[PDB]
Design a protein around this ligand. Sequence first.
Ligand SMILES: CC(C)CCC[C@@H](C)[C@H]1CC[C@H]2[C@@H]3CC=C4C[C@@H](O)CC[C@]4(C)[C@H]3CC[C@]12C
Ligand SMILES: CC(C)CCC[C@@H](C)[C@H]1CC[C@H]2[C@@H]3CC=C4C[C@@H](O)CC[C@]4(C)[C@H]3CC[C@]12C
Lengths: 313, 313
Amino acid sequence: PLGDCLRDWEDLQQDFQNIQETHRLYRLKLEELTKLQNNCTSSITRQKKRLQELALALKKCKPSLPAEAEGAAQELENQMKERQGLFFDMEAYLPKKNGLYLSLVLGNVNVTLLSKQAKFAYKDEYEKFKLYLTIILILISFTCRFLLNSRVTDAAFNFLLVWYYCTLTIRESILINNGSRIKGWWVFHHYVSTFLSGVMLTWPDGLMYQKFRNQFLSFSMYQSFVQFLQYYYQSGCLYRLFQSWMWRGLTFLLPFLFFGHFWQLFNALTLFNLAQDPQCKEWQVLMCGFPFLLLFLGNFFTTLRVVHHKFHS
Amino acid sequence: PLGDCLRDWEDLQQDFQNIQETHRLYRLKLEELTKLQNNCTSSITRQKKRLQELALALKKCKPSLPAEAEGAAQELENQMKERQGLFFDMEAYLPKKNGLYLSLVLGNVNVTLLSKQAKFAYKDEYEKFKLYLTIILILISFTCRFLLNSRVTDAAFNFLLVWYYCTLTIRESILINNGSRIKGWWVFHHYVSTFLSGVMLTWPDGLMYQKFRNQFLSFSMYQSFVQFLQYYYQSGCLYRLFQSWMWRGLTFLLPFLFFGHFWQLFNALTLFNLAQDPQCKEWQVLMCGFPFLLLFLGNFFTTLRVVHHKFHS
Ligand SMILES: CC(C)CCC[C@@H](C)[C@H]1CC[C@H]2[C@@H]3CC=C4C[C@@H](O)CC[C@]4(C)[C@H]3CC[C@]12C
Ligand SMILES: CC(C)CCC[C@@H](C)[C@H]1CC[C@H]2[C@@H]3CC=C4C[C@@H](O)CC[C@]4(C)[C@H]3CC[C@]12C
């Protein structure tokens, strides 16, 4: 028929012109928003730069004799520090340039959430993803280790591990760009773990490979488990957002982390001893011996430093 | 001293309060922009849905007898099609949800450029990145093939290839989300090439591995070169943004692509023949034989289809 469909088409035309009017409207608003945003970011970067120059100059002029009321200078210094903090939390609400690593993978993209709700929801989704992939990883590890599939599934498991670590690197860099305090060591931890898994992947079937696959699968399984536990603790802590229960839980969780660290060290040691005895594949055995050692070293060092920093309270 | 630095601090305070006022201002504008954007996208999705329902209903009621002035119905159909196009190009200016793949790697990020200039600049940067990494790849290929380093550098070259193909997958998906017509086959081409390079990486040193490394490095080198040439042609074409020179250049470039395709086929065939004769590592040789064949099949098929589509003009 024609009449019913034509009349519905007319109603559609009305709603069409309405939507078109509104969409044509907000183009100008979007333009003005981008303009003002650009102006604001340029200005704040300029002012922060000049403020830092003032800070350096005054710090150099600072150590002079305190015979005068230089306590006022200390107050001015507190003021500079709080100004830096204000500029910081203000600019966190404003989009930034990627940096180096993200520019290499994505490049010239304005990946910067601009709402506390959206930012927090994204971080929560990130942790949930880490948990789910940890479950998948532990089930594949259990299948490969005990269920007697020692032919290929180790290759697939290693592919999964390397993809996991690369995508966690990317999400970690996005989180750093959006703002967090994880810029210390872990972004390199993920790199070195990726390298270790790759080297272990190149490793072709010899004989010692059996002993080492046994140790390595068992340890990776245990680390996946402790990863699950750490996720649950940190998700409980975020849902809390108290302090006493948090500190008690961290004290309960620290021994497992130290046990994992020293397991890493013992694995590296048995790897050295194995590479000492007559055995080919020295390339792979030694270039997979180095990581475990370095990874343990950095991990234990950072954990000791952070627990001392916390207890310093 | 105190006076000079304090007076400069006062000027800094003035500019500080100014910047603070402007930044506190544009918060509300940002809020209203997000609100209006959400309203607009919800409304347009709703209206597009209902329009599609109308389209289905009228298409089903359409094949009735044309004894009446059903040419008006054909005009209404043209109107529906142009309405779909209008909704399309309008919504392209408006941010979208990631989809499936990007949600798996990044997740809940509003990666959608909102300016023709920014979008075009990003696409150009993408092509320039492809070129630069192609140069790096061809130089590493030349070093590995002829310069007699047939021990490890093949592993490093393969790591580079797999990282290249994964990051091109990500950039390709971002480009599809931002809007392009490359949703046909290539997003799966990159996947299958990644799989092939991985399988070739697992391959441990036998004897036939020598013959196959020779053929494979030579072919990968040639494909890198033709990739460079295709980049230069397409960058010239975009800088043009004529048609006659474009068609002549594509006609000049087609034979190289067909030669590469048939080289792929011949490589797959020699791989089958090699796997036929007594030789272990059947896992790797055959699971690396399948890709070349399938990849050639899809590539040649798509190239024939697209050249026929173009000549159809
Ligand atoms: C104070 C410090 C020195 C205490 C260190 C205790 C360490 C050495 C103990 C505690 C946990 C133990 C490890 C538990 C699990 C494994 C995995 C197994 O496949 C090999 C033995 C190995 C690796 C053990 C080695 C010894 C070990 C690491
Ligand atoms: C009409 C069409 C099918 C003719 C196709 C002819 C093709 C198959 C011929 C012409 C050029 C030949 C190639 C010349 C160079 C090389 C590089 C060498 O390292 C492997 C063999 C290889 C790859 C040859 C394979 C077969 C080849 C590609």
